[PDB]
């Protein structure tokens, strides 16, 4: 009933700013490790174990009972949602029968030594949803999760490394973990998940420990890990994942094709003809040419690549990544106050089976419903506000969702995005006319994107 | 019978090297302008007029009589091969009926004021083919052509600029041309053809002249041009086109995705995470941010972009472009000596209705059939020799054609490509066995890619 997790969620309900709620929840997650230290020295660099000394820390997030219930009450499929795996005599086996994962089947596999992995707990647990939806706001990147249930004296998976930053939350029982430094330069901060390794591919762990409930274990993409239950106790953990494909290189991948295009359009030097005869000295068949033009060609290509930096539309790409992040995000979890001050909590009056709202005025005080639900993006000379409030808890079930923002409302919209959580009077919005102030505010409110200082209707 | 064009083609037939032939033909094309001056100062920079003072200069390349004949004897289609166009009352009209362009239809369109434009004369004229096949070898880029026949007192086309470098060869009659400097910075060396312009979009011509037969007019992509026949005389010209999408930027377009990919794979700095909160200070809503992290973000982008050069597979991209060029190329036109010394000129012996006859030997002296017909390209794990000798005179009618070169033949193949036109003994080829020397030479010969010093039969 009353755990540190339930206490901190009650606290978050009272923090008016979504930004401040995200920072606090992250702070709680790694408490008493300071986030400042964590992000400066440890993140993307070191494996980290937080010994919590509190078995109740995470209670309410997820339990085996929740798993059983979801298998029974929801349409959980093998493969798509749940895997059954064993690592036995040095080999990973997958024992997923096809179709629905009923309790009977899942618990038999478990008694046969199979670990069970739930791929999308947030689609089924509202507590995991809330937890992820808040944390994503301070990562700037989708926050996903997997739940792992491993029976006693067993190992579910071959050693591997992931392509995401991982925070292992130990929920029930105990598990012996071994985590390894990237084995080689190319596996440091790996771009994609590893193959299954054998114990012969591995050195000595940088960290080897038995996790107990309440503990946390963080480690970067590229760090090989494996885990096993010792005698008697089963293991249940939740792994929070973020930062899949969120590298400088991913940023450059979107920028360069646009940069080249802009250069070629804006600067005639990029549009000049290649030499007529460069094929006599460039290409595989000429890799040992002594021709001094070869060196001049190589050097010109290098210098032109570097000059491309000037034409890189860094801002438009930050925005595209912002739009993708909106699209990937979980829908928000509203505080009581947010619900009550928005379209979501607007009560309807009923008289003899029929309904009987109240319009916004220039005196209505407003601000964005939350700080991480919307993004203004220029595309093709139009302006669009993309938002998360209609996203599903299933990853990319819904297509990207936006509304057009007209040029005469652009400054008002920017003010609203930039001034959260401060209230602004609709009559103060810097639009051309009074009708524009009202129309913009009403559009945003009716769509679930704005709250008012006092509700617009009452019981 | 005997024009400067026929004389120069006869001369080319005696120049053993295809490279030299190409340079000599280009020299002839702009004579007496030196190519060295042309390529250093004029190319891609200036409109240029060569007043030849010789009406016969181009005789034999193409004529109205050739057009008539090709309409009658070949399957020339409207749209695909020939357009009938008029510029009248300030508008471009296309009067192309669908289907085949018979003489009757084309000459009626002509008499109603239509210019006739032949999109692919080299598909039908063996002299235009030869001319283009030789010149492409000194451009490093497909050489195309169009033929324009414009009736008297008429204009076929709206003013426009092209996306290729143009050399207008005046073949018959006279035409008043007006050429314009790029109107604006973005139209200098333009990347794609212009819309149809009106006379109101245009300034004063940088060059305005009446071309006569023999004359040449060159002008770069981006230069607006138009032309018209005055009283009495019709006009026939051939425009030679090259250098479509052959820019540094096109080269960089193909290199950047590979460069990023190699950098992210080979160097951990490209694999580090972006900041969690960069969206608070980057993006269009933040172009005026005071935030000093915006400045540090920009600097890191610049430093990472500058380092990308080290991971660019410049040779691999040169090769891809070389393969596209092989694919785009016209098939070669062999000299007499080339034909006779290759598989093409090998006679078959017939006895009582059956064929009867040499193998190459380690003593046979060889070199590539021509210098511009083949290219070694590394792709995936493998090595392939792409070649032009099976290309059609129609652009991309044939898909790209290659044969695999096994790793232990690579050096020999390179020596052959790099040492043309010097004869090498098959026994001198730097392979690892005698059998490899022979197999590589035989494969190349049988494919039409090699000639021998003496015929084999
Ligand atoms: O519990 C495991 O066996 C296991 C294996 C691989 N990965 C994870 C994880 O949380 O990443 C857990
Ligand atoms: O002769 C013409 O009207 C004309 C128009 C556009 N282009 C060309 C050409 O030779 O490019 C010629
Ligand atoms: Ni893992
Ligand atoms: Ni033109």
Q: What is the 3-state secondary structure (H, E, C) of B88-110?
A: ECCEEEECCCCCECCHHHHHHHH
Q: Which of A280, A285, A287 is nearest to B415 (CA)?
A: A285
Across the interface, do A188 and B271 touch by the CB < 8 Å criterion? yes
What 3-state DSSP class applies to A367? strand
CB B58 within 8 A of CB B214: yes
Query: What angle do helix axes B292-307 and A248-266 make, rounded to 10 degrees?
Result: 80
The length of chain B is 457
Supply angle C-alpha B14, B18, B23, rounded to 5: 95
- Residue A59 burial (CB count, 10 A): 19
The domains found in chain A, sorted by start residue, are: 1-247 (2.60.120.650), 248-311 (1.10.10.1500), 312-459 (3.90.930.40)
Query: What is the residue with the minimal CA distance to atom 11 of ligand 2?
Result: B239
Q: Is B375 exposed, middle or buried (0-12, 13-18, 19+ CB in 10 A)?
A: buried
> How many whole angstroms separate alpha carbon B117 and alpha carbon A445?
62
Q: Terminal CA-to-CA distance of chain A, rounded, Å?
A: 31
Sign, CA dihedral A249-A255-A261-A262, equals negative
> How many whole angstroms separate alpha carbon B310 and alpha carbon B290?
34
Cβ–ligand 2 distance for B166 under 6 Å, the answer yes
> Residue B449 — φ and ψ, nearest 5°?
-115, 0
- Residue B87 burial (CB count, 10 A): 21
Token pair listed for A456: 């617009």
Query: What angle do helix axes A292-307 and B314-328 make, rounded to 10 degrees?
Result: 100
Q: Which of A10, A4, A28, A22 is nearest to A135 (CA)?
A: A22
Q: Which of A160, A149, A151 is nearest to A121 (CA)?
A: A149
How far does residue A119's CA lie from ligand 3's centre (Å)? Answer: 12
Q: Which atom of ligand 1 is nearest to the CA of A115?
A: 3
CB B213 within 8 A of CB B172: yes
Token pair listed for A326: 């909106």
CB A239 within 8 A of CB A145: yes
A393: Cα separation from own chain's centroid: 12
Sign, CA dihedral B167-B171-B175-B176, equals positive
Across the interface, do B263 and A271 touch by the CB < 8 Å criterion? no
How far does residue B82's CA lie from ligand 4's centre (Å)? Answer: 15
HEC assignment per residue over B177-208: EEEECCCCHHHCCCCCCCCCCCHHHCCCCCEE
- Nearest CB to A248; choose among B243, B266, B304: B304
Cβ–ligand 2 distance for B222 under 6 Å, the answer no
Give CA separation, B114 vs A225, B153, B154, B198, B236, in Å.
77, 11, 8, 19, 13
What 3-state DSSP class applies to A281? coil
Q: Which helix (H) or strand (E) holds A318?
A: helix A314-328
Count CA atoms closer than 13 A to A219's CA, side-chain side: 24
> How many whole angstroms separate alpha carbon A387 and alpha carbon A327?
8
What residues of chain B lie within 8 A of the CB of A301, using their CB? 251-252, 255, 309, 312, 314
Q: For chain B, after which residues does the C atom lie more than 2.5 Å from the next written residue's N, i.e. where is it broken?
A: 357
Q: Terminal CA-to-CA distance of chain B, rounded, Å?
A: 34
> How many whole angstroms separate alpha carbon B292 and alpha carbon A22?
23
CB A332 within 8 A of CB A18: yes
> What is the helix, strand, coil percentage profile of chain B, to 5?
40, 20, 40
Q: Which of A327, A329, A428, A433 is nearest to A377 (CA)?
A: A327
Q: Among the residues of B291-395, which ranges form H helices? A: 292-307, 314-328, 336-340
Token pair listed for B252: 């960089």
- Residue B88 burial (CB count, 10 A): 13
The label of the residue with tokens 């033909």 reads: B25
Q: Which residue ranges of B make up the annotated binding site for Fe cation?
A: 160, 162, 225
> How many whole angstroms separate alpha carbon A154 and alpha carbon A228?
6
Sign, CA dihedral B241-B245-B248-B254, equals negative
> How many whole angstroms separate alpha carbon A417 and alpha carbon A411?
10
Query: What is the residue with the minimal CA distance to atom 11 of ligand 1?
Result: A239
Cβ–ligand 2 distance for B227 under 6 Å, the answer yes
Sign, CA dihedral B312-B316-B322-B328, equals negative
> How many whole angstroms separate alpha carbon A126 and alpha carbon A9?
13
CB B225 within 8 A of CB B159: yes
> How many whole angstroms separate alpha carbon A225 and alpha carbon A219?
9
Q: Is A76 exposed, middle or buried (0-12, 13-18, 19+ CB in 10 A)?
A: buried
The beta-carbon contacts of B406-414 under 8 Å, at least 24 apart in sequence, are B407/B383, B408/B432, B408/B436, B409/B436, B409/B439, B409/B440, B410/B376, B410/B383, B412/B436, B412/B437, B412/B440, B413/A285, B413/B376, B413/B385, B413/B440, B414/A285, B414/B376
CB A133 within 8 A of CB A334: no
How far does residue B195's CA lie from ligand 4's centre (Å)? Answer: 11
How far does residue A216's CA lie from ligand 3's centre (Å)? Answer: 14
Those residues whose C-beta lies under 8 Å from the C-beta of residue A353, and which sit 6 or more positions away, are none
Q: Which ligand is nearest to the CA of B171?
A: 2
DSSP output for B13-60: HH---HHHHHHHHHHHHHTTS-HHHIIIIITTT--EEE----TTTTTT
Bond before A161 cis per omega within 30 degrees: no
Q: Which atom of ligand 2 is nearest to the CA of B239?
A: 10
Q: Which ligand is nearest to the CA of B158?
A: 2
The label of the residue with tokens 């007209």 reads: A406
The label of the residue with tokens 């080290």 reads: B310
> How many whole angstroms separate alpha carbon B134 and alpha carbon A410?
59
Tell me the technique behind this structure.
X-ray
Sign, CA dihedral A4-A131-A86-A181, equals negative
Beta bridge mates, B351: B354
Left if phi > 0, otherwise alpha if psi is -120 to 50, otherwise beta: which for A330? beta
Q: Which of A236, A79, A90, A244 is nearest to A157 (CA)?
A: A90
> How many whole angstroms separate alpha carbon A43 and alpha carbon B173?
78
CB A236 within 8 A of CB A63: yes
| Ion ligand 4 residues within 5 Å by Cβ | B 162
What 3-state DSSP class applies to B382? strand
Sign, CA dihedral A439-A443-A445-A446, equals positive
Q: Which of A285, A244, A85, A284 is nearest to A162 (CA)?
A: A244
> How many whole angstroms separate alpha carbon B47 and alpha carbon B192?
19
The beta-carbon contacts of A12-17 under 8 Å, at least 24 apart in sequence, are A12/A134, A12/A335, A13/A335, A13/A336, A13/A337, A14/A335, A15/A335, A16/A335, A16/A337, A16/A421, A17/A371, A17/A420, A17/A421
DSSP output for A64-95: HHHHHHHHHHS-PBBTTTEEEEEEETTEEEE-
> How many whole angstroms separate alpha carbon B241 and alpha carbon B228?
20
Q: Which of A435, A436, A367, A371 is nearest to A407 (CA)?
A: A436
Token pair listed for B448: 């039409």
CB A191 within 8 A of CB B271: yes
The label of the residue with tokens 């035989």 reads: B442
Give CA separation, B300 vs A245, A437, B51, B304, in Å.
18, 40, 56, 6
DSSP output for B52-79: ---TTTTTTS--HHHHHHHHHHS-PBBT
């Amino acid at each position: 009933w009353d755990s540190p997790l339930r206490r901190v969620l009650a606290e978050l309900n009272r923090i008016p700013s979504s930004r401040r709620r995200a920072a606090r929840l992250f702070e709680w997650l790694i408490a008493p490790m300071p986030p400042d230290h964590f992000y400066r020295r440890l993140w993307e660099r070191e494996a980290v174990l937080v010994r919590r000394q509190d078995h109740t820390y995470y209670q309410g997030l997820f339990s085996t009972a929740d798993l059983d219930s979801m298998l029974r009450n929801e349409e959980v499929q093998f493969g798509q949602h749940l895997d059954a795996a064993r690592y036995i005599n040095g080999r990973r086996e997958t024992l997923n029968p096809p179709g629905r994962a009923l309790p009977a089947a899942a618990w038999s596999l478990y008694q046969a030594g199979c670990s069970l992995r739930l791929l999308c707990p947030q689609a089924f647990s509202t507590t995991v949803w809330q937890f992820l939806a808040v944390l994503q706001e301070q990562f700037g990147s989708m926050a996903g999760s997997n739940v792992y249930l491993t029976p006693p004296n067993s190992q579910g998976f071959a050693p591997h490394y992931d392509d995401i930053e991982a925070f292992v939350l130990q929920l029930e029982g105990r598990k012996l973990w071994r985590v390894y430094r990237p084995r080689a330069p190319t596996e440091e901060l790996a771009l994609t998940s590893s193959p299954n390794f054998s114990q012969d591919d591995l050195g000595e762990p940088v960290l080897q420990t038995v996790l107990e409930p309440g503990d946390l274990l963080y480690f970067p993409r590229g760090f090989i890990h494996q885990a096993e239950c010792q005698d008697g106790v089963h293991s249940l953990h939740l792994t929070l994942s973020t930062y899949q494909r969120n590298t400088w290189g991913d940023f450059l991948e979107a920028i360069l094709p646009l940069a080249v295009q802009a250069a070629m359009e804006e600067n005639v030097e990029f549009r000049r003809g290649l030499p007529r005869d460069f094929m006599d000295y460039m290409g595989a068949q000429h890799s040992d040419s002594k021709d001094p033009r070869r060196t001049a060609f190589m050097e010109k290509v290098r210098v032109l690549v570097a000059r491309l930096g000037h034409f890189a539309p860094v801002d438009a790409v930050a925005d595209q990544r912002a739009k993708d992040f909106i699209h990937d995000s979980l829908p928000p979890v509203l505080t009581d106050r947010e619900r009550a001050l928005s379209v979501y909590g607007l009560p309807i009056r009923w008289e003899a089976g029929e309904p009987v709202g109240a319009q916004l005025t220039t005196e209505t005080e407003v601000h964005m419903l939350q700080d991480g639900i919307a993004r203004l993006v220029g595309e093709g000379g139009h302006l669009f506000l993309y938002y998360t409030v209609e996203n599903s808890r299933v990853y990319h079930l819904e297509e990207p969702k936006c509304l057009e923002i007209y040029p005469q409302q652009a400054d008002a919209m920017e003010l609203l995005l930039g001034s959260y959580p401060e209230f602004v009077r609709v009559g103060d919005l810097p639009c051309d006319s009074v009708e524009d102030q009202l129309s913009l505010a009403t559009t945003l409110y009716d769509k679930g994107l704005l709250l008012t200082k006092m509700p617009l209707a009452l019981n």
